[PDB]
């Protein structure tokens, strides 16, 4: 059972994708501003489960377009 997700990242072939869950990933690489990625997930469900840190935050959901405008925050 797949779900349709907003796709918003360098790797998207289009505005949506389908997968087992939808994802948002907020990433702060050293010295730069946090960057937000939206897409789908099929492997590495365990990434959904990590506690947020100062440099990364994962969000996963499995409803239709459930990641469309979710916005995350990083640890202080």
């Amino acid at each position: 059972p797949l779900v349709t997700c907003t796709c918003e990242s360098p790797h998207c072939k289009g505005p949506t994708c389908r997968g087992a869950w939808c994802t948002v990933v907020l990433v702060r690489e050293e010295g730069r501003h946090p960057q937000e990625h939206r897409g789908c997930g099929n492997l590495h469900r365990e990434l959904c489960r990590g506690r947020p840190t100062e440099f990364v935050n994962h969000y996963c959901c499995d409803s239709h377009l459930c990641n469309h405008n979710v916005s995350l925050v990083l640890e202080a």
Partner: peptide, 13 residues
């Protein structure tokens, strides 16, 4: 290969 690693690049754990 910038985090997060796209699944089509079949990253290992």
């Amino acid at each position: 290969c910038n985090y997060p690693l796209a699944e089509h690049l079949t990253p290992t754990k």
